[PDB]
Amino acid sequence: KGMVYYLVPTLLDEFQTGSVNALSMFLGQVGYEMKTLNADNKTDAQQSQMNDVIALKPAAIILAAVDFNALKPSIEAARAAGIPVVEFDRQITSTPSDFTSVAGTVEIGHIAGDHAISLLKGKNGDVKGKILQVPGDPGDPYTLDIQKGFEEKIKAFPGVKIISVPAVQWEASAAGTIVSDQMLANPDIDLIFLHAAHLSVAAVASLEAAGKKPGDVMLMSSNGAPVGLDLIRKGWLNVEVEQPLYAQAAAIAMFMDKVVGKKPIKAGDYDVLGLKSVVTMETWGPNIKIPGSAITKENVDNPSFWGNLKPPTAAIKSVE
Ligand SMILES: N[C@@H]1[C@@H](O)[C@@H](O)[C@@H](CO)O[C@@H]1O
């Protein structure tokens, strides 16, 4: 049917390596081969790779941009040369793509927010306290939009103080250092919210080295990686708001025939791996937005949560 290239930004967590495996398999089910190129968090490498792939004229490119600004010209070059470009996970609103498959990021933030509020209230009686937020890389719209959705909720209660410190390049060691430094300066911190679970792995270790045990400082993160689900069962993590990795990948495969053949993608409500998903036509082109979900000890074992690594059995079917 055609070759698809995936320009993955890094392979430095379970969502990234997982996305490779999920895209390859689902694209295999609808008849496409896939090849993966890793930018390892270097914009230069990814732009070199775009051009390399442009020159290889595949049936489509799937991009998850290291930096959402820097790649805008690249995306345009591909489309100039009539190569379909699909944006995965990291939304690029500034220039048209042929398809976009993302989580509801602002909504994940909102969900994070609601729980931060119910937590704190649970601890402090009133909606008050202090939160440390550890967003991801500033070049990444996934964490940028989660930040908006989260702050929107918290700001509504000025009795909650927020301290936010980004983990540059999505690095857990940066998270680690932030948590130790912010904790020493603020022993009153009630909750840390980090925008992906591999960051919470560092937070836990930092909290441990300060003498803390599970539950002492509440913790939440927002991508659903396996390590997060581990930390939930261990009592370290109060909440993990997942993004639906498998659905986001499957959605790309479901629509690949429309994307490769340059056929239109119809707006509406779709089911993707059992998730109600919403396709709209945006200025950056067709866009499917798949909901995230709050996970706690109470539902951490649900097989629909990608962190349990139970991908749906059967197969994807191409949208007609
Ligand atoms: N949505 C993903 C998130 O799960 C995480 O893999 C991050 C890489 O650390 O990149 C993107 O933000």
Same-domain check for residues 108 and 69: no
Q: Is 16 in the pocket of ligand 1 (CB under 6 A)?
A: yes
Q: Annotate 113-144 with b (16+ C-beta within 10 A) or e (fewer).
A: bebbbebbeeeeeebebbbbbbbbbebbbbbb
Q: List the CATH number of the domain containing 318.
A: 3.40.50.2300
CA 159–ligand 1 middle distance (angstroms): 31
Q: Quick check: CB of 290 below 6 Å from ligand 1?
A: no
Q: How many residues does the chain have?
A: 320
3-state secondary structure of 191: strand
Ligand 1 centroid from CA 126, angstroms: 33
State the resolution, in angstroms.
1.9
Backbone angles phi, psi at 189, to 5 degrees: -50, 120
In which domain, by residue range, is 6 found? Answer: 1-101+246-288
Do 172 and 320 lie in one domain? The reply is yes
Evaluate whether 316 touches 29 at the Cβ level (below 8 Å): yes
Residue with tokens 């230069």: 44
162 strand-pairing partners: 131
The finding on whether 15 has its CB within 6 A of some atom of ligand 1 is: yes
- Number of separate domains in the chain: 2
CB-ligand 1 contact for 306 (6 Å cutoff): no
Tell me the two tokens of residue 94: 């500034």
Domain shared by 153 and 39, yes or no: no
Residue 34 DSSP SS3: strand
Full DSSP string of 201-257: HHHHHHHHHTT--TTSSEEEESS--HHHHHHHHHTS-SEEEE--HHHHHHHHHHTHH
**Phi, psi (rounded to 5 degrees) for 165:** -145, 105
Q: What's the sign of the alpha-carbon dihedral 109, 114, 120, 122?
A: negative
Please check whether residues 295 and 221 belong to one and the same domain.
Answer: yes
Say yes or no: 154 and 34 in one domain. Answer: no
